[PDB]
């Protein structure tokens with residue numbers, strides 16, 4: 001289990017060193033998206049929260065295909081505003097309910113260090 005807390009101030013530096021295997025060691029869900037919302041990384045804890053197979057969602061568009069319930073100003077809108085500005089860092093609660101039992105989560109979106117990369121972190125609430 002990787003020793004990183006959800007919402008930590010330097011999380012983007014800590015996660016910069018992690019291959020897909022170390023990402024699976026996190027205590028919380030972690031998704032990496034490009035600026036368009038395409039899934040670059042998707043860890044085991046997120047698969048546990050959502051039911052999706054982490055290997056099978058890589059390459060899919062999060063907002064268009066995987067997670068349409070986030071296609072809204074309250075989630076996607078915050079994401080694309082942060083991508084456009086280049087300083088994405090926002091935390092909010094949300095309910096995931098597409099083809100799943102509705103699940104309330106806390107979401108932290110933060111711009112990655114890798115430039116055109118953005119983290120979406122998720123934990124249960």
Ligand SMILES: *C(=O)/C=C/c1ccc(O)c(Cl)c1
Pocket residue numbers: 031046050052057066067068069070095096097098
């Ligand atoms: C609602 O459509 C949200 C669905 C959803 C949220 C988070 C993750 O990781 C996935 Cl695969 C789907």
